[model samples]
Target chain A: MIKVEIKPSQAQFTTRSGVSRQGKPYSLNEQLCYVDLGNEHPVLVKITLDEGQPAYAPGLYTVHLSSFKVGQFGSLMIDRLRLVPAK
Target chain B: MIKVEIKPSQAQFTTRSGVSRQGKPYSLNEQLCYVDLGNEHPVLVKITLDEGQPAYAPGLYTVHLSSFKVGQFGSLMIDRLRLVPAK
Candidate 1:
């Protein structure tokens, strides 16, 4: 069980989103959708748990995770992300 | 294989989203997050496949399934969703 410190275990940060370098979102008036299109770009996300397992067990977990864009000159993006219990 | 019919497998519908009745999102201006907050409301989603197995196999597929608010006078929302190899 992740020791939920009541401080919101994760952080949400924005960057020149990987696709941002494509010179502004190609799609108009849209925020990032969790929809996976196998994109090279991604909204950066980071997570840490006191227990260090990093995934919540079933029972309502609001989760999102991402990794850096593939490699050098890579964009930090979502790797393997999921929703897990915060309790 | 879900016999990709090339029609995008599912349809996107808009409605008086379960939370819409809160009288125009109280959260300033923002879209929905995949984070499960354990609320009574939900984002609706539906899916259909030629083989009828809404879930795809491994390789990389996109899936987002939701359900209507549970019971009468309920909010429409997402039920269960995932990602599988769409190939």
Candidate 2:
């Protein structure tokens, strides 16, 4: 697990178009968040919000590092994320 | 970027066998740390030790999230890692 502070104001929301494994065209909506880790430089991470999944608000979060990945074109991805208390 | 506390005692160091991109067979040495985040279940992350890289001592660390990846067999990988002060 890893803790990161999401800066929503610095984030960008966009859709990525691609073909799925089933040969169907897809438009995947994603949120690219600017993550802050105290003294370290901010990193842009791409998060795919599943259907009915709530969008992230600015705050602290606990990420399943095992679910993290370097996606196509070197984009960072986190498949699992959970909001956590600031404490 | 993301912050995690490394529990070195709970970590495991091993080598993974594979062929490199240059067709040379290689035994890649790695460190798999049990990472802790406040109030969250710890995760196992694999870190490749480059030549001359120092082994991690138990402490807090700031990881470059963008360099994270889900490697073979669902193993988590972090290509860049840095130790940080506990403050």
Candidate 3:
């Protein structure tokens, strides 16, 4: 697993459209977050751990990354992110 | 190829970080765009065709998608999008 230190910013609930398994147009409302890795812009992180949003506010965080995939809308979508103590 | 009708919104230039082939931490500046598929939030499409931004204004567009991938920033990133006449 890759562990990176970063901060979540631009937290917002947004909807994305996609073709469902049944091949029907579908949209979903989801909370998306971005973590800045000290770059010109922050990396968009679709928070699967939505329950952790309260503590995962726009602040320094160490994220444990397991896998990454392309979201239906075509962004860098990731899964299995474990939040570690920011040290 | 998957053809979809949508509109591009929230166009902006952003930077993302990643480990390079040489295993060095790197970040890249890119122009990102979002296409809403009639969802609560628009799908974030990282525009590889930066030159097409002029014509890809926030309006109805029929996009011919060739492939999709996970971007360094972990957002829904797409490539090889062919824009057809909006009819």
Candidate 4:
């Protein structure tokens, strides 16, 4: 293990702009998708789709969270879920 | 965005047992890999490699962080990377 750790504030975090089928642009500071790297905590992540971002299906994504904040709660933003071919 | 927030403590949190190249198994409560979800605070996670776990390569994974915990510091565990197909 190379001790993988990501500082979202230093990564690319953007927001999705447009109707999300759920009825609005994805809230960057609200609902989100995340992954557990088996750390002391689960790494919180957001995947805000761009105005033209949409997959209409479940798939693997290489998303990033930025504008990192910490307090009673924390949040990040997303721009794309660029899918990858999964097996 | 259906407000996707993951409460790791209520999730699957575990510990990694074995060597981590770092000279020992990934310290579930120590160093880790996390994704930042734009929130008041960024969520923390861990990825512990099992005795038979090894990738030696970089790839996308559909992993889960169970046994979520909270406090001054939180942690999760990893059992598999369950690599998914990607483009």
- iRMS of candidate 4, Å: 12.0
Runs of candidate 1 with Cα error greater than 4 angstroms are: A1-43, A54-87, B1-44, B47-61, B64-85
The digit string of per-residue lDDT tens for model 1 on A52-87 reads 343332232333322111222211122323333444
Q: What DockQ does candidate 1 have relative to the true complex?
A: 0.02
Give the TM-score comparing model 2 with the true structure, all chains together. Answer: 0.42
Q: Is candidate 2 or candidate 4 better by DockQ?
A: 2
lDDT of 2 by residue, B30-81 (tens): 6544344422655555555444555555766555544544334433345464
Model 1 Cα lDDT, one tens digit per residue, B13-72 = 122323347667422211111111222232222223322343332232333322111222
Chain A TM-scores of all predicted models:
0.22, 0.53, 0.35, 0.27
Residue A2 lDDT in model 2?
A: 47
Report the candidate with higher lDDT, 3 versus 4. Answer: 3
Better of 1 and 4 by TM-score: 4
Docking verdict class for candidate 3:
incorrect
* DockQ ranking, high to low: 2, 3, 4, 1
Q: Give the TM-score of candidate 4.
A: 0.20
- Best model number under lDDT: 2
Q: In model 3, what lDDT does residue B21 have?
A: 93
lDDT of each: 0.26, 0.49, 0.42, 0.31
* TM per candidate, chain B: 0.20, 0.54, 0.34, 0.26
Q: Pick the candidate with the highest TM-score.
A: 2
- Model 2: lDDT to the true structure: 0.49
* Candidate 4 deviant stretches above 4 angstroms: A1-31, A38-44, A64-87, B1-87
